[PDB]
Design an enzyme around this catalytic site. Structure first.
Site, PDB file in Angstrom:
ATOM      1  N   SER A 291      19.722  55.113  40.849  1.00 27.28           N
ATOM      2  CA  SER A 291      19.712  54.810  42.276  1.00 27.28           C
ATOM      3  C   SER A 291      19.898  53.337  42.594  1.00 27.28           C
ATOM      4  CB  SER A 291      18.457  55.337  42.977  1.00 27.28           C
ATOM      5  OG  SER A 291      18.618  56.698  43.324  1.00 27.28           O
TER       6      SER A 291
ATOM      7  N   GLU B 274      25.900  61.773  43.693  1.00 32.93           N
ATOM      8  CA  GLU B 274      24.597  62.314  43.362  1.00 32.93           C
ATOM      9  C   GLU B 274      24.675  63.837  43.269  1.00 32.93           C
ATOM     10  OE1 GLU B 274      21.991  60.768  42.552  1.00 32.93           O
ATOM     11  OE2 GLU B 274      22.050  58.762  43.435  1.00 32.93           O
TER      12      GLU B 274
END
Length: 261
Positions: A44, A140
């Site tokens: 992230s 993602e």
């Protein structure tokens, strides 16, 4: 092999994993690096690059951050703490950026990637600001597979520290956009056990954490000590076991070692 190296090397050795560190002190532009040129899965922490690239777009599309974006049931992925609150409704690009940065929302990151034309548009922004090392290859959640040896979705500690400095302290973004990125990073909700936990109480911090498979545990931070010029610190950590648990304590410990030298 400055005093910090042996200490960072000892921390890594006690940890059973692989540690990468890069610090930049803006007071004099010196750097401390441990595995500074090895690649690590960003997880992230790549959300900083995507959010910054959208901010760059808003320097010309002045109302871009206020643009509503539908959240459809099909947009949801594996970790959607904010976007799940708005399915069949909308979130603005500012709200999606904040959700990505401060809660690590993966649906929000995917909306940012889409706004940039795919992972290659995030990498494009890294090149536009002089980062030749960052590469984003997947959306993602697959960008977090963190497979050892896999170059996808990696950067080096040295490159990410220079980039974070340019975005938050330099002029890679317009001043309005830089301020917005800083406000976002300072409002991060996921960083209390990571770099922040190893630094003096009085230092203001903006950070973005990352976590992925192989126990990958990351944090990238801009740091304002009191009465002192700001710092930039990247701490990346990954482990030999695909199923390894998170080790935010290692990043706190690396930050403390850095803060003591």
């Amino acid at each position: 092999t400055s005093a910090v190296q042996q200490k960072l090397a000892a921390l890594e050795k006690s940890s059973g994993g692989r540690l990468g560190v890069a610090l930049i002190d803006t007071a004099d532009n010196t750097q401390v690096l441990y595995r500074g040129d090895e690649r690590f899965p960003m997880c992230s922490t790549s959300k900083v690059m995507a959010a910054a690239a959208v901010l760059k777009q808003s320097e010309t599309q002045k109302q871009l951050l206020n643009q509503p974006v539908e959240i459809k049931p099909a947009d949801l992925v594996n970790w959607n703490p904010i976007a799940e609150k708005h399915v069949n409704g909308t979130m603005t690009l500012a709200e999606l950026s904040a959700a990505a940065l401060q809660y690590s929302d993966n649906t929000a990151m995917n909306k940012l990637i889409a706004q940039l034309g795919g992972p290659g548009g995030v990498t494009a922004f890294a090149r536009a600001i002089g980062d030749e090392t960052f590469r984003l290859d997947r959306t993602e959640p697959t960008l977090n597979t963190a497979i050892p040896g896999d170059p996808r979705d990696t950067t080096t500690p040295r490159a990410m520290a220079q980039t974070l400095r340019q975005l938050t302290l330099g002029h890679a973004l317009g001043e309005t956009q830089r301020a917005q990125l800083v406000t976002w990073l300072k409002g991060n909700t996921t960083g209390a056990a990571s770099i922040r936990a190893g630094l003096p109480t009085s230092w203001t911090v903006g950070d973005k954490t990352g976590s992925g498979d192989y126990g990958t545990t990351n944090d990238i931070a801009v740091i304002w000590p009191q009465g002192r010029a700001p710092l930039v610190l990247v701490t990346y950590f990954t482990q030999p076991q695909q199923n390894a648990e998170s080790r935010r304590d290692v990043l706190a410990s690396a930050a403390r070692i850095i803060a003591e030298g």
